[PDB]
Amino acid sequence: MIPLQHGLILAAILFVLGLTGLVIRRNLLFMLIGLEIMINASALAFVVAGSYWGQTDGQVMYILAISLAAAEASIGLALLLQLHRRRQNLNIDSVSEMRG
């Protein structure tokens, strides 16, 4: 007796909060944090969708979503470590050389 609309609304709220955190923060670590929030919100939305229909498909795509999240966080933190190694700051506005 939990509506599907409420779970989807909660997931959409978490997704837009993650997108806002991804946009308004120049720190690369906070952008990776925002990316984790958005992909976790997408996974939560899929879990809600699979639980409404009574199928394991939601949890299977949750598993695929968090496999992607783990590997993307790995690559993003490796790139963040490399950025901090070669330029000692995580401000991405310095990383803007290609333009036009």
The residue whose two tokens read 């990316």 is 35
Residue 31 · residue 92 · CB < 8 Å: yes
What are the backbone dihedrals phi and psi of residue 37, each rounded to the nearest 5 degrees, phi first? -65, -45
| x-or-dash string of contact with other proteins, 45-84, rule CB under 8 A | xxxxxxxxxxxxxxxxxxxxxxxxxxxxxxxxxxxxxxxx
Instruction: Please state, in angstroms and rounded to a whole number, the distance separating the CA atoms of residues 42 and 18.
Output: 11
Q: From the CB of 50, what's the least distance to other proteins, in Å?
A: 7
Q: From the CB of 12, what's the least distance to other proteins, in Å?
A: 4
Size of site (CB under 8 A) for other proteins:
96
Residue 59 · residue 44 · CB < 8 Å: no
Q: From the CB of 38, what's the least distance to other proteins, in Å?
A: 4
Q: From the CB of 94, what's the least distance to other proteins, in Å?
A: 10
Site for other proteins in 7-46 (CB under 8 A): 7-46
Q: Looking at this protein, which amino acid is placed at residue 73? A: A
